[model samples]
Target: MNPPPPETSNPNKPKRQTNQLQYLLRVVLKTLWKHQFAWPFQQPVDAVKLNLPDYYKIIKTPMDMGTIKKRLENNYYWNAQECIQDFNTMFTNCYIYNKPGDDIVLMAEALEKLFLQKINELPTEE
Candidate 1:
């Protein structure tokens, strides 16, 4: 009898390089989510109308730049050169991926408000 042929690999499975990119995207999304709920904004007054109090439970302590840098180092997908290129492309494509115009501005404002409120709520030591 002829020997059975070895099973073919599943074509549906992601390639290693694709998986790496996916992992990096996941990390970026997670970091953005964290920052969205943590920093709220670069300023304070904007936090008031943004409904900060309602979302307080979802917020975590603010991350320092050092911590963010370390996290990016550990999770960002591309090398320095690749990262720069990727980031450039990402920004160029942002409008294609993001909510458009006024809605995006509103959403950004809301996120900022939520983030700043969380910061205000943090203990003085933070």
Candidate 2:
């Protein structure tokens, strides 16, 4: 997958439903993906340690929100490769993360604050 991931998703949620991490991650995602280096696991050992124990036992997601948030905040310098490392880390562990409703709502809330600007760009009806 690419950045700006189908904002149409989040399934039935069009408002603030965008994955802030994914959309904002364009800088990192686009860069690494362009070079065919989207998988962080493919990197040399010790490049980016996968912290699997921080999360629940099931699904075994590698990156937690704290780590992801920091990277998200530092997205400008988020280093393209870490982007996909985070991607698979998160994707691989998605089920347990959402097994409860808390994280889902938290995500819904943090989707992104950029939509207002995005919305403003909508072409005005003639």
Taking the tens digit of each residue's C-alpha lDDT, what string does model 2 give over 15-58? Answer: 22124345534443333333322343222122124443433444
Please provide TM-scores, in order, for all candidate models, with all chains considered together. 0.24, 0.28
Per-residue lDDT of candidate 1, residues 1-126 (tens digit): 122221223355332334334433344424445564334222221224664452223322222223333333444323333332433332333233335774544545454454345434433221
41, model 2: CA deviation in Å?
21
In model 2, the runs with Cα more than 4 Å from the true position are: 1-55, 59-61, 64-66, 75-78, 95-126
> In angstroms, how far off is 39's CA in candidate 2?
25
Candidate 2: residue 53 lDDT (0-100): 47
What range of 10 consecutive residues in model 2 has the weakest lDDT sum?
Answer: 1-10
Say which candidate scores most in TM-score: 2
